[PDB]
Amino acid sequence: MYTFVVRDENSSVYAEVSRLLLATGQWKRLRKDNPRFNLMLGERNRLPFGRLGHEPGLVQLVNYYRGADKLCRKASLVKLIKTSPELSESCTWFPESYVIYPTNLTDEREVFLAAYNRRREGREGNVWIAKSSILISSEASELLDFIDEQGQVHVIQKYLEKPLLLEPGHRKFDIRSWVLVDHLYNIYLYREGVLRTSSEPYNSANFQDKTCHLTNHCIQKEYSKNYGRYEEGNEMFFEEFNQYLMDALNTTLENSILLQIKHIIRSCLMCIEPAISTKHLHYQSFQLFGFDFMVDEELKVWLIEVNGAPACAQKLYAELCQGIVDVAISSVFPLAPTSIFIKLHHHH
Amino acid sequence: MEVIELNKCTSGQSFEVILKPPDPSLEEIQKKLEAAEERRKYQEAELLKHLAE
Amino acid sequence: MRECISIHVGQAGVQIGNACWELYCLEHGIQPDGQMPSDKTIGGGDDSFNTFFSETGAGKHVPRAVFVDLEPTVIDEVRTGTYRQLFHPEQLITGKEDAANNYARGHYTIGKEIIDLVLDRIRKLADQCTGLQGFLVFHSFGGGTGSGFTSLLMERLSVDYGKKSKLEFSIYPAPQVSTAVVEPYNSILTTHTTLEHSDCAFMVDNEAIYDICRRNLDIERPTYTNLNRLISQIVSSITASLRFDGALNVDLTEFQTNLVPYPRIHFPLATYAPVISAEKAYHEQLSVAEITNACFEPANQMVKCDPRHGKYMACCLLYRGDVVPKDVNAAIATIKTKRSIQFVDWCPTGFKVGINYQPPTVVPGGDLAKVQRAVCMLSNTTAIAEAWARLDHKFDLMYAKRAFVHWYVGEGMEEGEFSEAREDMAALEKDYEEVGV
Amino acid sequence: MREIVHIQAGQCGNQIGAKFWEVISDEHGIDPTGSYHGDSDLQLERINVYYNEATGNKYVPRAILVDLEPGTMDSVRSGPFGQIFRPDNFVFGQSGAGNNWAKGHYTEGAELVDSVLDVVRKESESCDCLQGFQLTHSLGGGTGSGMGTLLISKIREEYPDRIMNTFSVMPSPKVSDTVVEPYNATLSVHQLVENTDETYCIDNEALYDICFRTLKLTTPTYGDLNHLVSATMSGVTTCLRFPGQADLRKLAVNMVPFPRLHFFMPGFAPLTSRQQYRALTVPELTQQMFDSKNMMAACDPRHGRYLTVAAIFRGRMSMKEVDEQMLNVQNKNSSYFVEWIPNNVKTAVCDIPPRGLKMSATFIGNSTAIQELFKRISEQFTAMFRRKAFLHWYTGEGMDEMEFTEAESNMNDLVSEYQQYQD
Numbered sequence A: 001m002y003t004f005v006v007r008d009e010n011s012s013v014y015a016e017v018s019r020l021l022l023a024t025g026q027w028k029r030l031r032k033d034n035p036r037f038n039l040m041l042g043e044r045n046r047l048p049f050g051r052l053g054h055e056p057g058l059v060q061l062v063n064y065y066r067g068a069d070k071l072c073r074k075a076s077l078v079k080l081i082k083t084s085p086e087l088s089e090s091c092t093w094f095p096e097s098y099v100i101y102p103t104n105l106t107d108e109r110e111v112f113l114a115a116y117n118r119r120r121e122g123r124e125g126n127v128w129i130a131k132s133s134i135l136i137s138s139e140a141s142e143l144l145d146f147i148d149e150q151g152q153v154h155v156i157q158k159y160l161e162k163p164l165l166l167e168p169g170h171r172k173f174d175i176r177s178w179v180l181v182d183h184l185y186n187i188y189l190y191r192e193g194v195l196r197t198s199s200e201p202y203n204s205a206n207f208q209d210k211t212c213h214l215t216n217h218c219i220q221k222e223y224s225k226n227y228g229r230y231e232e233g234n235e236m237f238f239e240e241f242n243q244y245l246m247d248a249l250n251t252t253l254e255n256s257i258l259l260q261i262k263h264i265i266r267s268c269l270m271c272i273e274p275a276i277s278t279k280h281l282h283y284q285s286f287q288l289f290g291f292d293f294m295v296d297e298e299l300k301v302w303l304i305e306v307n308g309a310p311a312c313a314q315k316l317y318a319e320l321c322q323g324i325v326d327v328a329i330s331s332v333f334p335l336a337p338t339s340i341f342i343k344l345h346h347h348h
Numbered sequence B: 001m002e003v004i005e006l007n008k009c010t011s012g013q014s015f016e017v018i019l020k021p022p023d024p025s026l027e028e029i030q031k032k033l034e035a036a037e038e039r040r041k042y043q044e045a046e047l048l049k050h051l052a053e
Numbered sequence C: 001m002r003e004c005i006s007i008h009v010g011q012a013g014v015q016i017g018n019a020c021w022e023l024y025c026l027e028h029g030i031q032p033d034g035q036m037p038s039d040k041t042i043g044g045g046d047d048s049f050n051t052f053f054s055e056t057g058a059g060k061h062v063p064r065a066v067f068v069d070l071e072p073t074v075i076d077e078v079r080t081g082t083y084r085q086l087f088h089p090e091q092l093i094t095g096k097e098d099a100a101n102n103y104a105r106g107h108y109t110i111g112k113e114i115i116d117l118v119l120d121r122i123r124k125l126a127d128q129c130t131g132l133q134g135f136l137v138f139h140s141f142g143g144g145t146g147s148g149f150t151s152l153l154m155e156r157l158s159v160d161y162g163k164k165s166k167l168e169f170s171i172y173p174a175p176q177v178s179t180a181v182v183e184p185y186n187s188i189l190t191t192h193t194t195l196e197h198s199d200c201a202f203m204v205d206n207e208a209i210y211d212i213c214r215r216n217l218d219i220e221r222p223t224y225t226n227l228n229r230l231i232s233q234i235v236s237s238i239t240a241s242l243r244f245d246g247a248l249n250v251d252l253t254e255f256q257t258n259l260v261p262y263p264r265i266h267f268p269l270a271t272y273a274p275v276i277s278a279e280k281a282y283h284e285q286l287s288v289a290e291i292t293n294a295c296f297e298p299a300n301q302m303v304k305c306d307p308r309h310g311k312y313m314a315c316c317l318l319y320r321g322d323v324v325p326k327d328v329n330a331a332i333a334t335i336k337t338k339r340s341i342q343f344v345d346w347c348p349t350g351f352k353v354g355i356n357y358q359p360p361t362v363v364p365g366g367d368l369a370k371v372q373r374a375v376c377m378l379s380n381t382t383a384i385a386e387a388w389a390r391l392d393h394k395f396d397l398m399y400a401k402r403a404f405v406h407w408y409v410g411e412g413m414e415e416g417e418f419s420e421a422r423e424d425m426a427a428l429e430k431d432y433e434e435v436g437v
Numbered sequence D: 001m002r003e004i005v006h007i008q009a010g011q012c013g014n015q016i017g018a019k020f021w022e023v024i025s026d027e028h029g030i031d032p033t034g035s036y037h038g039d040s041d042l043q044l045e046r047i048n049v050y051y052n053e054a055t056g057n058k059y060v061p062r063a064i065l066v067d068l069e070p071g072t073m074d075s076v077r078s079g080p081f082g083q084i085f086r087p088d089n090f091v092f093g094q095s096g097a098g099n100n101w102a103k104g105h106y107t108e109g110a111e112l113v114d115s116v117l118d119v120v121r122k123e124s125e126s127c128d129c130l131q132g133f134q135l136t137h138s139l140g141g142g143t144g145s146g147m148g149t150l151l152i153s154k155i156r157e158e159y160p161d162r163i164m165n166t167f168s169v170m171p172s173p174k175v176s177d178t179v180v181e182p183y184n185a186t187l188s189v190h191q192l193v194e195n196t197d198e199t200y201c202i203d204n205e206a207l208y209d210i211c212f213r214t215l216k217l218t219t220p221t222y223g224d225l226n227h228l229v230s231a232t233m234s235g236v237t238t239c240l241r242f243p244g245q246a247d248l249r250k251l252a253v254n255m256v257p258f259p260r261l262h263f264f265m266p267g268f269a270p271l272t273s274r275q276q277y278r279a280l281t282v283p284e285l286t287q288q289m290f291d292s293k294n295m296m297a298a299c300d301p302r303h304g305r306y307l308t309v310a311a312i313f314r315g316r317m318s319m320k321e322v323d324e325q326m327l328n329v330q331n332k333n334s335s336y337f338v339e340w341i342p343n344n345v346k347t348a349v350c351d352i353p354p355r356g357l358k359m360s361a362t363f364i365g366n367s368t369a370i371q372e373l374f375k376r377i378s379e380q381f382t383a384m385f386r387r388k389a390f391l392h393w394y395t396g397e398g399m400d401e402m403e404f405t406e407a408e409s410n411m412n413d414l415v416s417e418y419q420q421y422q423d
């Protein structure tokens, strides 16, 4: 009889995993503070990694990688890419970014302005976006002043002015990929992604109205008037998107986009493996990641960010959560296909 | 990667490599010990009083 | 030459001390009868090994050691054991009933009645010293004597030997080899009262030693003898610089200067490699790079924690055996490009290296195989705060219900000492976080 | 040299005590004449814990036999090992206690108690370093219950910092000599709450059910019950009589988190009926040891929570497999262990097994489920006290009703204290 504890009541993903675990009849849920557990579904913030793996005879597993925050933080990701030789400052799939600390608090203000002034002089498009852990503008003055009005670290990265627009609609979108890393650091890409589409026509001459520029599911369902017009819940899945790429662009989702997505996932996760691997640790970790990508009109894939506590598409909860149990939990605590994941092989 | 202060002798050697630059008094202890003894004496006295009753 | 006095308190301190002095004698060529044929100066001398051994007119080399326990069964092993002839009776101090795993019983009730005698015996050893450096104190956190009497002894030592350094070798409690539930209480109580009196403390978590014995030595259920012989190898690596010719860590003061820039954060992490089973027919001799790389694996640390998620304040590499500086620097360069070694911005990113050409000595019939080269890394990392957090958490669980508190109050301790000690530990955890994040 | 002084009082106390000394004398290789004839040095390593060494290499139990009538101690002196006890350590009157706590505590017992203390003092004076005392008695009678608790009170007055341990047999209407047993047991329990450091609660109802249901004895006798008590007493004192860890005070420190909650439920395995030669595996030993049917307090552990648990394994077995099974019982039923005492389940192993068994396990639990035992006694007490029934036996000895009402409230307070830690 295996034992687990639930320490994040707000996780829709691991509420289903917990539901599945109990349904097997071979897992028992303890009080959240009971130290005699095999599996911890930990809290998002300040997870007590230091107390794991010190119960005699208990093989203990947790659903988060200590140190994975370096990848799942706005400013942290930028610093990681610029300072890690595996990714380098010339990384071709990450938008030119800069970490800007508000003046009321290293910082990259002067470096940003230098590159900003260069684009302005060369007639090039100079539209940046400021965000933290949102404002879109082409004037450096407005971007820096907006950050000083806040008190948290922000990042300024280039705004993809030439995004791939779906038709009909002429509308922006982004691609969410769910990736699972087990205790052995196998990288599993869920076969099912989701396109979070904008239900408004993309307008390049008005960044003030952010409805057609931000493809967040919450913004479209609150400030967009065409929500659900083209696809239910502004969510297009790979089957429809692949069929579209073939009909419109005479190409496939695997060739035009997925190869780059798999390459980006591997690069990011392999880069931090020595820092977060639990191979020789007194406890074991796995974690579910949400990678967000942008695709431009040239079919080049750009990484936008990585989410360390992602939610899932309503239609895909059952399949993904069961997969988490099969490859992440039961592989360590076996019970008494055609896998839904794509293993991204790599050198350890 | 610099080495400094290399010292050698018959039984070994030592050096330094730089990869990058940047109470209660005796009286007070007695009081604490005696205060604890007094507390034990008081607790034992109360027990004996309880048993005498 | 400057002398060092070793003090062993309680069962853990005594049994570990017994294993250490057994090893010291083998390393210096001293026989169980105390004779040392290699020592050509009969009756005296100021050689490096004389920091730990005095000499009688008859040529006997006597450890500068005192053993103290409230129950005699552990120390009776010394009085009749192999090395019974090394110590004279004045050095072995035993009572009749122990502190019952009760810090307050060892510190107050019993400590008050035996402290003066223990200091007198220590004074007799000090009177034999021309320039006493200080003391090395071995004890458990969990025992009533190891925790309670040690803290009282350390307080009196600061009074009677103000200018003398004091180092600790402390056994951190692990339920796998413990039958006492109150050890978190005792550990926090003794750390609070000893913190201001200890210049540098080497904590050894029984959980780490236990798993190294099972994993590397293929011992299914290690005994205290298995644990102590491994611990004594690590202790020997740490104190070798005091007992052999050299220029690194040559006196107790140097341990603090090299390992402790901030006085309260004085708990360096020890990591030792290689630990090879003697039952193996023949093992591939590991290189300098390989044993150095092993110093950054959690599996060979004396306290299980993750130094990848802390900051370093100091790092010292102590090699024994066939090692030349060329290969050390080559290994360090390789590890920097592969490991996550982050120093605090106010400390230099460097390593102090000591090499002793004499490889590790293995006790005949022990569990450890003879190796051509071994290394002990001493790093002052904030990652060891994980061990304080673990211990403080168990404390909080029991103290919230006042479980077992009456045993301590019954010995004359005020309940307020619990919260005073716990708040001190909270301040210690805050100091670590301020430096490491 | 951590000596223990053993006292046995009244009929039950002396009959169980006699069997205890017969069992451990066999384990230590001591014959009925006090002469050692074992074959293992482990038999003598800690022999002085319970035996004094007389001239001629003779070992004499450090035992004091007390009663208010001569009958039972005459049987002991004529029993198997009756000749092994010190003749001067027999202290007895002629009046009897009439199953009356007041006679044992205030009148008949009061006239004899000073002479018992003289023998206790004599034995204590010849101890290198006395650990404490252990008393065997029943709570339902008059001598063991009334005079036994009187003795405990006077021993605590003279030896206030020594550990006092008891094996206390709790009465049951299923195995009853007289109807006043709940009166005597309620009066005694308050004394135990105040004046002992550790009490092993042995319920005659649990002993009966074990003999009848598990051992398949059609007509259990007091002798059959005492066989279980002997085996249990040997099990829980193994860690005192052989090399290990250790002493009564250390045991108390790790078993008793709150001073009044010092009443333990003991258990034993195996309990086999005559399929008796079959080898018993570690899993079987561990599963039975935690089974309610193997426990002797007649309380359902699954009705409360374990504050602390000690388990002793005897015999040449796999200590690796012991830890795996122990860690399996906890990590499979952690809902019955309080989560605010970390690592509150301790395991110890002893190489010497009990006579006739390849291996065995003894269980010592400090469980809040023991409140069920005190609740049963309290309800039986009140059913009679509500009508002042049989009180004249006690008022005739000078007791007042107010002392009964105070004992009633004292034990209900104790029940209330267990209930708060069970939630």
Ligand SMILES: Nc1nc2c(ncn2[C@@H]2O[C@H](COP(=O)(O)OP(=O)(O)OP(=O)(O)O)[C@@H](O)[C@H]2O)c(=O)[nH]1
Pocket (backbone or CB within 6 Å): C009, C010, C011, C012, C013, C015, C016, C069, C070, C098, C099, C100, C101, C102, C106, C140, C141, C142, C143, C144, C145, C146, C147, C171, C172, C173, C174, C177, C178, C183, C206, C224, C227, C228, C231
């Ligand atoms: N490594 C190691 N740990 C030990 C040894 N002996 C005891 N311990 C540990 O020390 C703790 C118990 O404290 P002890 O040193 O035995 O107790 P003490 O200092 O003699 O104090 P009291 O017996 O209570 O008076 C437990 O955590 C044990 O695991 C030993 O020989 N080696």
Ligand SMILES: Nc1ncnc2c1ncn2[C@@H]1O[C@H](COP(=O)(O)OP(=O)(O)CP(=O)(O)O)[C@@H](O)[C@H]1O
Pocket (backbone or CB within 6 Å): A095, A129, A131, A157, A158, A159, A160, A161, A172, A173, A174, A213, A214, A215, A216, A292, A294, A304, A305, A307
């Ligand atoms: N450099 C850039 N160029 C173009 N669009 C961008 C961009 N950076 C962000 N966006 C837009 O912003 C949206 C999401 O922004 P971002 O992911 O930084 O905020 P967020 O993290 O709160 C949403 P989530 O974490 O759920 O993916 C995307 O739909 C994308 O279209």
Ligand SMILES: Nc1nc2c(ncn2[C@@H]2O[C@H](COP(=O)(O)OP(=O)(O)O)[C@@H](O)[C@H]2O)c(=O)[nH]1
Pocket (backbone or CB within 6 Å): D009, D010, D011, D012, D013, D015, D016, D097, D098, D099, D100, D138, D139, D140, D141, D142, D143, D144, D145, D169, D170, D171, D172, D175, D176, D177, D181, D204, D207, D222, D223, D225, D226
């Ligand atoms: N287990 C057991 N219980 C007994 C024995 N003799 C008496 N009892 C119980 O003890 C109580 C009677 O007390 P008893 O010891 O005979 O009275 P005393 O001589 O005045 O102390 C009743 O609850 C009996 O069931 C015995 O030999 N074994």
Ligand SMILES: [Ca+2]
Pocket (backbone or CB within 6 Å): C039, C040, C041, C042, C043, C044, C045, C046, C055
């Ligand atoms: Ca000499």
Ligand SMILES: [Ca+2]
Pocket (backbone or CB within 6 Å): C158, C162, C196, C197
């Ligand atoms: Ca000092």
Ligand SMILES: [Ca+2]
Pocket (backbone or CB within 6 Å): D111
């Ligand atoms: Ca009379």
Ligand SMILES: [Mg+2]
Pocket (backbone or CB within 6 Å): A305, A306, A307
């Ligand atoms: Mg995000």
Ligand SMILES: [Mg+2]
Pocket (backbone or CB within 6 Å): C010, C011, C071, C098, C143, C145
């Ligand atoms: Mg001890």
Ligand SMILES: [Mg+2]
Pocket (backbone or CB within 6 Å): D011, D012, D141, D177
């Ligand atoms: Mg009777």
